C-alpha cells in the first residue's frame, strides 16, 4: 500500500500503510481552470466518503491512486 505526498509542490509520492489511508484530492475545478490546472492538495485519509461535492475532498484507497501525472509517451 502507498499514498502519494500531500502535493506541497514537488510531487515525490509517500507511503501510507496504517490500514486505512486512501488518497484524497483537494481541488476546486480541475481540468483546465486557471494555469497550473487547479488546486489539488493531495493527502492521505482513512475514509473514502462519496457525494456531490462539486468542489471538495475526493477519495480513493488501494494504493498510489493520487499520482496525477499519468501521461504516457505517445
Amino acid at each position: 500500500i502507498v499514498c502519494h505526498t500531500t502535493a506541497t509542490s514537488p510531487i515525490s509520492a509517500v507511503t501510507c500503510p496504517p490500514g486505512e489511508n486512501l488518497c484524497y484530492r483537494k481541488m476546486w475545478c480541475d481540468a483546465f481552470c486557471s494555469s497550473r490546472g487547479k488546486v489539488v492538495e493531495l493527502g492521505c485519509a482513512a475514509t473514502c466518503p462519496s457525494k456531490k461535492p462539486y468542489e471538495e475532498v475526493t477519495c480513493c484507497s488501494t494504493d498510489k491512486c493520487n499520482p496525477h501525472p499519468k501521461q504516457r509517451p505517445g
Partner: peptide, 19 residues
Amino acid sequence: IPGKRTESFYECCKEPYPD
C-alpha cells in the same frame, strides 16, 4: 510588493496557486 507566497498547491507547479 510580494506578501503572500504560502497559499496552496495546484496541478503540480503553481507554487503560489492564487495568481
